[PDB]
């Protein structure tokens, strides 16, 4: 009859008459839609360039609901002014469950900061040849040759978590600290109900990254509903302009992919392409979004149906989803990166041996129950 073959416990390559292939190994190499809701496509932007509101990532400001976030590997435009990002990899874990925004102003410019000027632009964040700055942050400078102290509160009326973002400037000279902020011993104190931190600038000459020898360290927090955050500074404050009322979702995530964007409909999605199948398992990628087959590190997995010519128990028990690309951890987190890669590769090898042995067990019981009735009849 046919030429399909199965593998068994003792013998392999058994020529049989019928088989069901439990592996979907193919995919359309594009980023199709998830149900009808289009994903978020950062393009040449980082996660850090998207929430800080890079001047070259203005086309993503308008989009506030998505199916998943698509980041490109080695993304060029993000954090245009050089500096640290305090708990950047922790914030990507927060934004891997957020399914909706509400980009609003906490401290509205032209009404919120009197006695200061909000026109602070840098040549590292230049947009269309002219120097610009972030779309969600304000660089406060002097007004009438004076930088007085500031104070602003914000009570969370939004009935949701509010992600507040700010930054502290770290200059390169002491003649530049006096020229902008007119004080040499400055501070930033951002307090809340369950948050309190005080920042102090560090004036030092750095290697030139994007042309600047000074740094801006970016910070964040998560306001609770009904809670108050109080900003207070003597200088060196890159002040919050916009923020986000966070709406949490269950099926979402950040994938890293170079696939072209198409207009499809799908049910599953991997960084190599979407999957349209009803088969139980897959070989494409462990990182899936949507209702998807289960990942096994196999190439040949068939269950025999008929005689030879001379599985829900595993799918119910996997229940784990892998999100690791290599962007999840830090320079100074390698004992936790090697622990995450031990756990992820350990569950991908237990559940591959479990799925293969159940096929090997069911193949010998099928071939001898079929060869039971040949001698009854």
């Amino acid at each position: 009859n046919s030429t399909d073959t199965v593998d068994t416990v003792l013998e392999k390559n058994v020529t049989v008459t019928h088989s069901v292939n439990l592996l979907e190994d193919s995919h359309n190499g594009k980023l199709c839609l998830l149900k009808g809701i289009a994903p978020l496509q950062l393009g040449n932007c980082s996660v850090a360039g998207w929430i800080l509101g890079n001047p070259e990532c203005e086309s993503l400001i308008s989009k506030e609901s998505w199916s998943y976030i698509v980041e490109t590997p080695n993304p060029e435009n993000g954090t245009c002014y050089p500096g640290y990002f305090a708990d950047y990899e922790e914030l990507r874990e927060q934004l891997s469950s957020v399914s909706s925004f509400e980009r609003f102003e906490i401290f509205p410019k032209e009404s919120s900061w009197p006695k200061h000027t909000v026109t602070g632009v840098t040549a590292s964040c230049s947009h269309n040849g002219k120097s610009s700055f972030y779309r969600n942050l304000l660089w406060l400078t002097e007004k009438n040759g004076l930088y007085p102290n500031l104070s602003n509160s914000y009570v969370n009326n939004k009935e949701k978590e509010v992600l507040v973002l700010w930054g502290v400037h770290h200059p390169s000279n002491i003649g530049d600290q006096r020229a902008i902020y007119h004080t040499e011993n400055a501070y930033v104190s951002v307090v809340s109900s369950h948050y309190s931190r005080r920042f102090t600038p560090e004036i030092a000459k750095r290697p030139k990254v994007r042309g600047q020898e000074g740094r801006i360290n970016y910070y964040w927090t998560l306001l609770e509903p009904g809670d108050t955050i109080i900003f207070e500074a003597n200088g060196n404050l890159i002040a919050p302009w916009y923020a986000f009322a966070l709406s949490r979702g269950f099926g979402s995530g950040i994938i890293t992919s170079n696939a072209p964007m198409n207009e499809c409909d799908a049910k599953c999605q991997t960084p190599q392409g979407a999957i349209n199948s009803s088969l139980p398992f897959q070989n494409v990628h462990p990182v899936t979004i949507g209702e998807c087959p289960k990942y096994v590190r196999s190439t040949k997995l068939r269950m025999v149906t008929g005689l030879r010519n001379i599985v829900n128990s595993v799918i119910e028990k996997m229940n784990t989803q892998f999100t690791a690309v290599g962007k999840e951890f830090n320079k100074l987190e390698r004992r936790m990166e090697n622990l995450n890669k031990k756990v992820d590769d350990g569950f991908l090898d237990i559940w591959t041996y479990n799925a293969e042995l159940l096929v090997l067990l069911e193949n010998e019981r099928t071939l001898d129950f079929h060869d039971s009735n040949v001698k009854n009849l």
Partner: antibody
């Protein structure tokens, strides 16, 4: 190679309107802005304003607010400057220039607008 | 508006001299250690040509005899050795605050 060619010289009467063109080529029209510099012979250069080619948002100086108005045609690479309407002042040359690094590096051939 | 005053009005220079063209702004044209002062050269009957951008970097395509320096409000343009093809008018232009403002000009006539 980068080039900005303009329209020819114009001769108007004080009371009607003129429209200057600036056909860019050799580079992507968006990702670079477009200045407009007024050279009046005998007075020196003056900055009319700047138009964002990606956004479309103009920004004028206050001495050029109200009459001078920039426009775009990004389907091709062409920027426009319309004056509404010409006095016997602003009888000058008009250069269109390009923003690269807060500067005007590639200029136009000049559009001699004479008001008679 | 930041008003910039060229100095001198126009300078007499022979071939092999050192021509110093200077302009002094009313306010400061730097922010975070980036001087926003550009230098332009205009031969008559031609558009101006960018030589030095902000405020010491030399643009590609310009001969290396041009060099400018300065910080804060005081900037100079120094030309040596002065070849004969530099018979033009020299402008300085700020890019710090809108609107952008040019100089008055300075003719470099060669003996």
């Amino acid at each position: 190679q980068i080039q900005l060619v303009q329209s020819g010289p114009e001769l108007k009467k004080p009371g009607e309107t003129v429209r200057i063109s600036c056909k860019a080529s050799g580079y992507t029209f968006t990702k670079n802005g477009m200045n407009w510099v007024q050279q009046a012979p005998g007075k020196g250069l003056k900055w009319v304003g700047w138009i964002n080619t990606y956004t479309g948002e103009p920004s004028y100086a206050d001495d050029f607010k109200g009459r001078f108005a920039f426009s775009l045609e990004t389907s091709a690479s062409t920027a426009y400057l319309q004056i509404n309407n010409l006095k016997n002042e602003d009888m000058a040359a008009y250069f269109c220039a390009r923003m690269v690094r807060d500067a005007m590096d590639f200029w136009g051939q000049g559009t001699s607008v004479t008001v008679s | 508006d930041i008003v910039l005053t060229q100095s001198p009005a126009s300078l007499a220079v022979s071939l092999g001299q050192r021509a110093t063209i200077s302009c002094k702004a009313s306010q400061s044209v730097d922010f975070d250690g980036y001087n926003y002062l550009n230098w332009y050269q205009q031969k008559p009957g031609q558009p101006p040509k960018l030589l030095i951008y902000a405020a010491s970097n030399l643009e590609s395509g310009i001969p290396a005899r041009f060099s400018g320096s300065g910080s804060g409000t005081d900037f100079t343009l120094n030309i040596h050795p002065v070849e004969e093809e530099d018979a033009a008018t020299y402008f300085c232009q700020q890019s710090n605050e809108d609107p952008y403002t040019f100089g008055g000009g300075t003719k470099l006539e060669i003996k």
